[PDB]
């Protein structure tokens, strides 16, 4: 069943419920929230890349009864987030993690793996 989002960074982003394990392999929201903490500086700083939406689509995926399996952000979203926050990442000496490899995500118009675009 779906559960309310407890991950502070993913509250109030336009869907209310997620379900664990997430797309990152986290057993619980507390574990997910901890792994997400390294991204907190980048998310407050506005790198205009929809980083919050992208991260939360993977760390706190939307859950509804309408769909069985999670719908992650599309690859193009991963890539635009990576590029737009790339300079501010150089300043904080933050390297984009191997776990967020954008090549892993589907893009739009794959009928078997749906993905989300940003609101």
């Amino acid at each position, epitope marked *: 069943k779906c559960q309310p989002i407890e991950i502070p960074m993913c509250k109030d982003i336009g869907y209310q419920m997620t379900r664990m394990p997430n797309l990152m392999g986290h057993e619980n929201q507390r574990e997910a929230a901890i792994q997400l903490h390294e991204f907190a500086p980048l998310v407050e700083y506005g790198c205009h890349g929809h980083l919050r939406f992208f991260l939360c689509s993977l760390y706190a995926p939307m859950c509804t009864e309408q769909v069985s399996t999670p719908i992650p952000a599309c690859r193009v979203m991963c890539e635009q987030a990576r590029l737009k926050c790339s300079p501010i990442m150089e300043q904080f000496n933050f390297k984009w993690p191997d776990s967020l490899d954008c090549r892993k995500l*589907p893009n739009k118009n794959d009928p*078997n793996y749906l993905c989300m675009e940003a609101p």
Partner: antibody
Amino acid sequence: EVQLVESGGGLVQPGGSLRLSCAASGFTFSSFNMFWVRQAPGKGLEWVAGIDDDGSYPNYGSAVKGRATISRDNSKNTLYLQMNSLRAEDTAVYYCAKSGYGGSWGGYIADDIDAWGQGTLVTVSS
Amino acid sequence: ELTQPPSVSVSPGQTARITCSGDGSYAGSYYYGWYQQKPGQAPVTLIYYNNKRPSGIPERFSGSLSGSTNTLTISGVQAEDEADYYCGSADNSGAAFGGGTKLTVLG
């Protein structure tokens, strides 16, 4: 050094079925995405299917989607391909191929295949 | 959609350039690998992740991404580089290969 050895090639009638397996050795199999790639006689490489480390997000090329199942058994370091309703134009050398990275949420890209099998020939004919 | 010239000619010691073009209108990033294949053999990987060379591949092979195009450059071409060359990448429909370039070494 990586070895990928395919088997299961042979002759099949149109509308028949194929089952390929690939035995992988030399590397930590369960940490890498694996692919099937095929080549019809005198033609180019065609990506057939791909599967992630755990076996959880199989995807397929256009020509085989809906007729194909890619799977793996990590306990036996073995990758499998199953295909139905075979067409003559499915005649091809089928290659087992190992990716240089692991993980997928349904997406695959053929930018880092780093080991190739020797291929096994499937002949589709009456 | 992934596009390669079907054929290229070089004479020995010269530089050959083989390109793979994808969808320039795409708003994200691109990734290419290059695979060499000789008649009757399996492919051999020359370049992965746009510009990385496996150890054991001669230094005269290199790749580089510009825009939506990746170019394989073979400097100082040898007769033993005569082969078909395929880029590996992704279409709008998923993982995919280019149609292949036949590279002829003259003389």
